[PDB]
Design a protein around this ligand. Sequence first.
Ligand code: HEM
Length: 146
Amino acid sequence: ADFDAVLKCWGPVEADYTTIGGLVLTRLFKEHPETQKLFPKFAGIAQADIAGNAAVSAHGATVLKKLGELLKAKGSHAAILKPLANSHATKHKIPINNFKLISEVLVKVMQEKAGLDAGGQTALRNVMGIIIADLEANYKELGFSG
Ligand code: HEM
């Protein structure tokens, strides 16, 4: 139910995954500057220079497309989220709390750009909580508990 609820507000996101993706990552790096260093391709770019950066926006589109895939899935969520945990724990080396931070940012960007109301915020927080708990479980299976 909460996945379908978030989709009621996803139109403006999916309309421009690149622009909205850039807003998300720009705001993540501005509000949580330690996260920028977890992206070696972006680490060191002056904050004032992130909003206009096409590579940052392209990666934000990758992120939001993956969330859209999850939301729209009729099949296994596990088939989509387990690889995501595997890569983020073992390749990218991302501490789990960062996923909470990007979720906070997404809520704000959807409030501002996608008409996310109180019920929609609930739903989105619920969906992101499901995602984060699954990532954390799969991290633990790989030996990551930090
Ligand atoms: C909504 C949560 C997130 C989603 C859906 C997501 C999705 C993705 C996807 C689909 C990729 C492409 C490669 C892969 O499959 O691993 C990726 C790569 C990556 N992600 Fe995430 N991610 C999320 C959160 C984060 C956070 C919070 C960080 C760091 C703070 C992070 C850091 C990275 C890095 C460093 C890469 C590799 C970029 C590259 O070298 O091109 N991700 N992510």
